[PDB]
């Protein structure tokens, strides 16, 4: 049950949002900080870029547009008018040790994940997810 009119609404709003962002003097990175400080909806420059270029899914774009439009209408209306975990950086040295563990055994037990996280001074959950994503990558690249 696809709606052509919804795609048009998104195309139009994408074009006019970029237009009006620029006219207000905001970079893509500026929009993303304004939405965090003001509304709690922190968003990266990457995500604003994808939204303006329509390079998000239809569902993701639909969910962001009202959050973007609210920001824009406020920023243009000045006549006296919980949060995602930060993306953990994994340095090349750590990645290489995890890769070696993965080649040894691509599915460490929970006890083994604990040992690894302690060895590398990491949180158990980050190591757990690293192995999940690495197993997924192995399926993706050998499809």
């Amino acid at each position: 049950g696809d709606e052509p009119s919804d795609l048009e609404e998104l195309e139009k709003f994408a074009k006019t949002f970029k237009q009006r962002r620029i006219k207000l003097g905001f970079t893509q990175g500026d929009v993303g900080l304004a939405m965090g400080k003001l509304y709690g909806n922190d968003f990266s420059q990457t995500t604003i870029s994808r939204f303006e270029a329509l390079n998000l899914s239809f569902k993701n774009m639909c969910k962001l547009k009202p959050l973007l439009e609210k920001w824009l209408n406020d920023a243009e209306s000045s006549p006296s008018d919980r949060k995602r975990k930060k993306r953990t950086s994994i340095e090349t040295n750590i990645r290489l040790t995890l890769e070696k563990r993965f080649q040894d055994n691509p599915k460490p037990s929970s006890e083994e994940i604990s040992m690894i996280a302690e060895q590398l001074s990491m949180e158990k959950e980050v190591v757990r997810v690293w192995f999940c994503n690495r197993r997924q990558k192995e399926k993706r690249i050998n499809c």
Binding site: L7, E11, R50, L54, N55, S57, F58, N60, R140, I141
Partner: peptide, 26 residues
């Protein structure tokens, strides 16, 4: 062979708009 290593948005609004434009002109 250069294989894409990471995850991608499989179907974008951009592509859906091109695809509606392919079906209308039909």
């Amino acid at each position: 062979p250069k294989v894409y290593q990471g995850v991608r948005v499989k179907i974008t609004v951009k592509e859906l708009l091109q695809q509606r434009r392919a079906h209308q002109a039909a």
